[PDB]
Amino acid sequence: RRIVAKHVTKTTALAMLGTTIVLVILQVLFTYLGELSNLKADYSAWQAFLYVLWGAPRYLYEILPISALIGAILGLGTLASNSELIVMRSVGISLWRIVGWVIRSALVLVLLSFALSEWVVPYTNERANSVKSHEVRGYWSREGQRFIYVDYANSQGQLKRIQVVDFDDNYRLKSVTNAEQGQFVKDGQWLLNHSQQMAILANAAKQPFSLALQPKYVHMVTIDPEDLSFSQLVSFMNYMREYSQVPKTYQLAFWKKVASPFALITLVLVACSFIFGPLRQQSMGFRLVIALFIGLGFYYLQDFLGYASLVYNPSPAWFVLGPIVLMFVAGSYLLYRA
Amino acid sequence: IIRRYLVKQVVSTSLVVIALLTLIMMGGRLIKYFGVAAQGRLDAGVLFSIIGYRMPEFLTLILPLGFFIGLMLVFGRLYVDHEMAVLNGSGISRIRLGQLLIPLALVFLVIQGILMLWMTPWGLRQFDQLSSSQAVRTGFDLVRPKEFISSGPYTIYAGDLSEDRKNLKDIFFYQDVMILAKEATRNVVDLIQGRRYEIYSQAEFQRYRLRLKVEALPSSKLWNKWNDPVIASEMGWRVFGPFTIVIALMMAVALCEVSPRQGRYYRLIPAIFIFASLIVLLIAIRTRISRDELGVWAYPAALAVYGIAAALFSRK
Amino acid sequence: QTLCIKHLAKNYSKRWVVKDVSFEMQSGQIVGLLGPNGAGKTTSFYMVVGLVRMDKGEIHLDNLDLSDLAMHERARKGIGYLPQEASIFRKLTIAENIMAILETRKDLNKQQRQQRLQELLNDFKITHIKDSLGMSVSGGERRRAEIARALAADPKFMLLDEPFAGVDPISVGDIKDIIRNLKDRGIGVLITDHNVRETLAICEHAYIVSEGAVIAEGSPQDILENEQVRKVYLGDDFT
Amino acid sequence: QTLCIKHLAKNYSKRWVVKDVSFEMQSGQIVGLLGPNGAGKTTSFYMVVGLVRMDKGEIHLDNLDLSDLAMHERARKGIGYLPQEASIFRKLTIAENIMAILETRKDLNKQQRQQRLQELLNDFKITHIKDSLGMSVSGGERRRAEIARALAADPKFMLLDEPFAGVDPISVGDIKDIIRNLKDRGIGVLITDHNVRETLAICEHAYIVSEGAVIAEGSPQDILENEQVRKVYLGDDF
């Protein structure tokens, strides 16, 4: 049982690839048209075109779910309108096996999504930001009961204008200190110069002390949680959790990233169920229109629930994985109706 | 009788498409605004007013596109159900059916002119005023849970925040002056179980209180002063935008042919991308007219280029 | 009135599907356009109707050239067309369906338009269902309403596409009676259909098209006697 | 082997299109399911095939109930189906078309799969066009390839949907010969078609469905002699 599987997989994969290419081209064009309204003297149209071109991997990563949805719709529509699925069933091949073949096709897009997220996006995104603008300042942070302010931090491992306040467990001042310059030496410890201090004044030419800030994560502060790769996001969240309180937006980013392949597979399954169900014996244009509506609805629901997770108390896991489970159940039921 | 049939079908389908596109676009914008409010940058209670005020500006785009899509759908259905075949076989051509809809196109043109000349400037004036009112947010208005928020000389950290932006917990506030507080509730902000320090002075409190353009101008002003390129561009864009209804009618008539096997929805995507080509050309010829490069005359010409092109195409 | 078609030809995908098809028809005469499926009869019929642009040939109607005229212009000259698939205006009433085409007549006014509507409704016996929508009528009554609507334009030649498709033997007699009524009305009927047996029963003259060209012509008896059609189209045994 | 269908019924838009349709068929027997267009024959046929969910009735195949089984499960039990419209895999070779269904057989291996492919190609005389794509073949050869592909699954009963649609009188003889070959192979053929004249010529047993119920049954001569079918379906002459 490989010839039919090979045929279905080839058709669906070619449909997905063509849809992905077309959507990437359209998004690049539309993003350029959008980024033609922010031109400045130091930011010309060529600079905008380069900025949009460098953002192509990010647009591709964001388009993969709807791309897979539309690819499944078009491939199975080509198979069905030609009355191939009817004969496939009439020889004993079940619906779930066809869905399994289409999922085999979509796993390539899932792998490409992982590769882009973990290897490609953090580089081209940085290049695009560098092009648009042309390693952090004013950074506040907490270490348990300590509050730290660093006016300038250099990822090479330097700090300028350090201020630190240490409180008692009862929130009473334990100490305060300032420093002109500082240098990381070992994990969790920094030397520094001009150590003015007060305790519950004092001065010192040079002294070391322990603080948890590390050069590794300094550059991550200016980057939005969503744009972080999975490795960077997990490492930064582990660091923050072990040393401070992790913000809810980072949890939302983590749950939205972990659920991406599941979202893609569930959307593909919904597409297949629609082809076998309501969208049987329908014009290819109608199938494409319904696929676009499903994609827009999914994106809007995902964004709205992510924000509602931020606004509301319970964990973002529910708000993120509810649509996936509900759509999977709906598609499974629609497949049960045959 | 055929005129009333076409008019009813087109009005029904065009209203459905207009409602659906309005839902799509401003649901997207509503979700973006909700996310911004989720970041504390905007009052979640007023964003509905923002959507209401921006209604006319999105309708300005949706109504031509909605009418175009409705015409395409109606004529595609006529072709698919062989009604167009019998209409042709009775001596009624496609161009004749397109001409029979001219009164409806004029009605839609009048409606869009009303939106363009009065409703859109009013909506964008109210929206600009409301945005200016909302943009002065600072301090506790921008506070986020488990994060440090810096505005002006103030920096705030809060450990928790309710569904409504009230009842903070674990409040830390920095200027010289430093303040800590077990609880707070919102510039008149109450702080409960808090301590104050100066950097040497110290104090305690169980309760304390802190205390820390052209697109919207009316047509009345713009009808004259054509000498200024910005006003020239705007007023030309208001005067010559409504004829996109006529251009949409004629181009939809030109591009509507489709065989029954292909389906009703086959030629929506290419036709919509041609119409979005008109829209983009216009949104470009505007930018230039403003920077004083192209001149106002370019507005009707562009339309004519998309008009004649349709008129010839329908007559091949 | 005589409609003459000469040297039609049409090619798809660089393959000549129709090559030098020609025939003639007259008002009050039933002519069949038959042949093996996909051999040219359907494409030639659509070339005559106007749905498909002609690559070669000419069409004349009493020294009036219809070659360059579009479909609706031909219809204005008196060439009506009845499609195989349903074509009744779905959301319009049957009375409205006929009146819509009646209003297109420049030589009538309201009173005689209404009188013509009444006569057509009585003639086709669909008067009792005049007030119902087209989408909610049976197949036979819908077809009769379509034929009445086509007659409302007063065509001189009526081109029927597969009138016997999906028709049980009980209603074939009624359809034949309808076609004979059109003939009696002075309208020359050009029928194209797969059901050769019933088409040859009424057609006064028949043309057989094979390999994209006309291979036989004459009365149905002459067609049945022809050896080439028997060899390629009808087979050794047929009646 | 006997396929028995009892008391089928199906309703659309709160209208009962099919009411108490029942019949029986046997392997090596040709049964026709005829009647006025839209009177129930097509819906009943699709209910038997499995395309349309059944609202009432039962189906048995030698004391094995097929009522609740889905389409593919019925096919696994030996019920093949030949659609009216083209169903050849467009972008697959004809040899590939047959081999795809052959590979689904659990009781065969590569050598006898190839041998069966060779026998089917020789039997249907489509061997000379074995290497061409399905989308680039003529109607008759395409239909023969479809029938060979259907036989590749070794069905016990074959349900044909309008086998004579769009077929000239010259090829009706070839199609009849093909159907008789299926009969000789031991496969009971259930034919549904509008062309009653040619269907009654070969069918050994025929059921006429009118008003959603079976009104006549028996040999074609018995059907032609029946007064009710003449009154409602066949007319006074035939």
Ligand SMILES: CN1C(=O)[C@H](CCCCN)NC(=O)[C@H](CCCN)NCc2cccnc2Sc2c(Cl)ccc(Cl)c2CNC(=O)[C@@H]1Cc1c[nH]c2ccccc12
């Ligand atoms: C300078 N521009 C804009 O600010 C327009 C008008 C906003 C107010 C409408 N009420 N919006 C945008 O850019 C924003 C980007 C947000 C940046 N923060 N979203 C995209 C967009 C919305 C509407 C029209 N086009 C575009 S993108 C585009 C497209 Cl499709 C084709 C060509 C070009 Cl050149 C562009 C870039 N944009 C512009 O040239 C417009 C020109 C303009 C000035 N006044 C207007 C009033 C109405 C319509 C257009 C204009």
